Amino acid sequence: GMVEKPQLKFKSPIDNSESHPFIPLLKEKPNALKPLSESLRLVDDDENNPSHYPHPYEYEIDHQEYSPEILQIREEIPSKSWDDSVPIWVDTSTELESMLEDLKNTKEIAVDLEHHDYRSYYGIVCLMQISTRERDYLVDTLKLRENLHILNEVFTNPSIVKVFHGAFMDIIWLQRDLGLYVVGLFDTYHASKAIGLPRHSLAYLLENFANFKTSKKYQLADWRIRPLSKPMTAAARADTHFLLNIYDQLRNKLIESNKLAGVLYESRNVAKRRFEYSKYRPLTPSSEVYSPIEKESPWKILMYQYNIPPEREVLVRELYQWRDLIARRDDESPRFVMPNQLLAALVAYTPTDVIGVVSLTNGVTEHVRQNAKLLANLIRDALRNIKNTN
Ligand SMILES: [Mn+2]
Ligand SMILES: [Mn+2]
């Protein structure tokens, strides 16, 4: 079909202006050790790190003690039979409340998410998967975008282990879109590395410990689509359905070889990762902070040198900045507005009228088609400025 942009239905409108450092969406702060008061303040310009808000749960992540049953080798619990249950679809505040009540009665849960970034500037969390020893949950993070914050009661309860595989970006996505934080994380990716398994991916773990073969024929899928297709519903359920059992085996092996403390340390730091706008990103790019990383051509004159002439970097740069502004304005990804190959195509052929712009041998996007005149003017200016100057 066409898929209507889910953003249009968000309770709170999106803001890509980036006129202030990221502000935590957190209004309440359960399992608090340090009041939310001190949390929402600021950290005035340093030199390495410009002004910004700190991670609202950083303190707890450092002080909150782990569940004593995590340091103990325990009899593992096999994953429940896939066919013995259906994944529980959650898309109403009432369904959300019941799941929540259920999660509060666990010792650990497995969590994962599905994300979308083609038709959104920063990106949007489209689905959340949660598994208990007994059931698999599929949460519509689109329809419940503003309600999900209540999961912090469990996501920040240090008495409940939250298991994720390589959650470095998921931690970022969770705060940015849902204002969710995690205290009591166990990252199976770091567990796999510490133990020294040949491969460290989720698929590798699923294949060898749960005899489940994965199909990456969905990491390019569109998670905004409602209802979810059977195959996508299954592939999402598979992210958390087998994870707690894998958690048991890796944990026991870590205790058995005295490496658990290191994995918990690595995990606390994954959970401490803070999301910030590229504009207010710290100088030295560290793993402690994340800011939007262009998924396309090198800022300005690209290295994909489509034989990019000398005096055309000004043109290149204007196209880049124009693209970014339109992307931000319409809340779209830069590639949806204009992919590097098209941008490159414009710079290479330098069309100066609408006909030239829309008939580019390569092809054209809706945005380029709708701004053909502006682009033809922009390009014409670039050429005129060249013929002059020198
Ligand atoms: Mn994930
Ligand atoms: Mn997935």
How would DSSP label each residue in 358-373? Answer: HT-TT---HHHHHTHH
Going by C-alpha positions, the residue among 210, 234, 251 that lies closest to residue 107 is: 251
Length reported for the chain: 390
CATH code matching the domain that covers 297-390, chosen among 3.20.20.70, 1.10.287.70, 3.30.420.10, 1.10.150.80:
1.10.150.80
Binding-site residues for AMP, please? 114-115, 173, 216, 219
**Which parts of the chain fold into alpha helices (H)?**
36-39, 58-63, 93-103, 152-155, 168-173, 188-195, 202-210, 230-241, 243-256, 260-272, 313-330, 334-337, 340-349, 354-358, 366-370, 372-387
Sign of the dihedral defined by the CA atoms of residues 67, 71, 75, 79, in that order: positive
Q: What are 164's strand-pairing partners?
A: 187
Ligand 1 midpoint to CA 238 (Å): 12
State the Cα–Cα distance between residues 370 and 237, nearest whole angstrom.
Answer: 40
Ligand 2 midpoint to CA 144 (Å): 19
Residues with CB under 5 A from ligand 1 (ion): 112, 170
In the three-class reduction of DSSP (H, G, I as helix; E, B as strand; rest coil), residue 219 is classed as coil
Going by C-alpha positions, the residue among 57, 150, 157 that lies closest to residue 107 is: 157
Structure tokens that stand for 71 in this block: 């340091």
Ligand 2 midpoint to CA 169 (Å): 13
What's the distance, CA 160 to chain centroid? 23
Residues 333-357 as b/e (b if ≥16 CB within 10 A, e otherwise) read bbbbbbbbebbbbbbeebbbeeebb
Q: Tell me the ligand closest to 170's alpha carbon.
A: 1
Ligand 2 midpoint to CA 223 (Å): 10
What Å distances lie between residue 130 and 89, 100, 371, CA to CA?
Answer: 11, 11, 44
Residue 89, phi then psi, degrees to nearest 5: -75, 130
* DSSP track, 101-113: HHHTT-SEEEEEE
Give this entry's resolution in angstroms.
Answer: 2.2
In the three-class reduction of DSSP (H, G, I as helix; E, B as strand; rest coil), residue 78 is classed as coil
Residue 305, phi then psi, degrees to nearest 5: -10, 90
Residue 195 CB-half CA count within 13 A: 22
Q: So what CATH class is 1-296? A: alpha beta
Q: How many other CB atoms sit within 10 Å of the CB of residue 39?
A: 18
Taking a C-beta distance cutoff of 8 angstroms, is the pair 240, 136 a contact? Answer: yes
CA triple 225-231-233, angle to 5 deg: 60
Ligand 2 midpoint to CA 201 (Å): 12
Q: Tell me the ligand closest to 112's alpha carbon.
A: 1
Ligand 1 midpoint to CA 90 (Å): 19
Taking a C-beta distance cutoff of 8 angstroms, is the pair 110, 79 a contact? Answer: no
Q: Tell me the ligand closest to 169's alpha carbon.
A: 1
Q: Where are the domains of the chain?
A: 1-296, 297-390
Binding-site residues, please? 112, 114-115, 170, 173, 216, 219, 239
Structure tokens that stand for 182 in this block: 């995690």
State the Cα–Cα distance between residues 303 and 289, nearest whole angstrom.
Answer: 26
State the Cα–Cα distance between residues 366 and 370, nearest whole angstrom.
Answer: 6
State the Cα–Cα distance between residues 338 and 324, nearest whole angstrom.
Answer: 10
Structure tokens that stand for 79 in this block: 């994953």
Structure tokens that stand for 237 in this block: 């359920």
In the three-class reduction of DSSP (H, G, I as helix; E, B as strand; rest coil), residue 185 is classed as strand
Structure tokens that stand for 102 in this block: 């259920």
Q: Tell me the ligand closest to 168's alpha carbon.
A: 1
